[PDB]
């Protein structure tokens, strides 16, 4: 190549930068994952807490907002899953 | 930031008249986690003086290819990555041995981990070499993967580990998610079809892998590994095929990165 890097047998350059592309994309996916999982933990707390009476509408709408954001998150993950499938030659 | 190659699937390979066996290095430590350096080093010396010793079979993986129990790699590339190592050096030999022992450690305590990293840095200080820098970085990386995944550091103040194999963080994070979404997301990000199916129990797959190719060849490959978060790729049939092929013929190298 243009700069010698200590590389073991299998590793050529093209694999090595392809690696960086995929590591970026899945880095985003991981951020989305831990986000969706914090939100789903807050959901667990709401749904477990019980005791709603007349304050129930506020609680139901806060659950509604959480669940809504989380749906958008999971769909974003799907949406770049498919894109990564578009880069590949077999799919 | 992740241009790092890491050695995976490290076993040691023996051949007694074309009858071949790839084994993990046995555990050299007690139930509390005291690393038996004396017996380990005697093992390594013994494997050097031996004549039925061919070397450590190892593979080189990139971070985005290792999905914990599936491989986002093509089979030809995978074959180019897998080598048969027999270094003309005792310390590199023992480093590969510790790599084997980390991958196949049943459930190490962080005490065994810190001892193992310690012995490793001590060996790597003895050998300035691209092979020792390689063996060391990757062995520390396997160590760190094991701690971060199993919560062995939890203490609060950081130890000298790193993030480990990246997709292992993804693997752990998706097991946490609602059962509904977890299944799909595992199917979409960490189940790469490219290396094909998994066999139910490798040992049987190698036994009939012997039945098929044993008229022309007296060659007989057997595999011994301890099941572990770091050895799940011994379930993959293409893996086992490539492994038998590499162990039975090919060549050896005295230097990984000459």
Residue numbers in the entry:
A (entry chain H): 41 to 131
B (entry chain A): 20 to 173, 175 to 278
Authors' own words:
BBRF2 is an EBV tegument protein that has putative homologues in all three herpesvirus subfamilies. Here, we report crystal structures of BBRF2 alone and in complex with BSRF1. BBRF2 binds EBV capsid protein MCP and capsid-associated protein BPLF1, whereas BSRF1 associates with EBV glycoproteins gB and gH/gL. These data elucidate the molecular basis of the functional association between BBRF2 and BSRF1, suggesting a role of BBRF2-BSRF1 in tethering EBV nucleocapsids to the Golgi membrane during secondary envelopment.
Finally, we obtained crystals of the BBRF2Δ-BSRF1Δ complex and solved its structure at 3.1 Å. In the asymmetric unit, BBRF2Δ and BSRF1Δ formed a 6:6 heterododecamer. Using the PISA server, we found a predominantly large interface area of ~1300 Å2 between BBRF2Δ-1 and BSRF1Δ-1, which we think mediates the constitutive heterodimer observed in solution. Three constitutive heterodimers are associated in a symmetric manner to build up a triangular 3:3 heterohexamer. Two copies of the triangular 3:3 BBRF2Δ-BSRF1Δ heterohexamer stack face-to-face, resulting in a two-layer 6:6 heterododecamer in the asymmetric unit. The antiparallel ɑ6 and ɑ7 of BBRF2Δ join at the middle of ɑA and ɑB of BSRF1Δ, forming a tight heterogeneous four-helix bundle. A massive hydrophobic network stabilizes this helical bundle and constitutes the major interface of the BBRF2Δ-BSRF1Δ complex. Two bulky residues on ɑ7 of BBRF2Δ, Met205 and Phe209, wedge into the hydrophobic niche of BSRF1Δ, and hydrophobic residues from ɑ6 of BBRF2Δ add to this cluster. The proximal end of BSRF1Δ creates a hydrophilic interface with BBRF2Δ via two intermolecular salt bridges and a hydrogen bond.
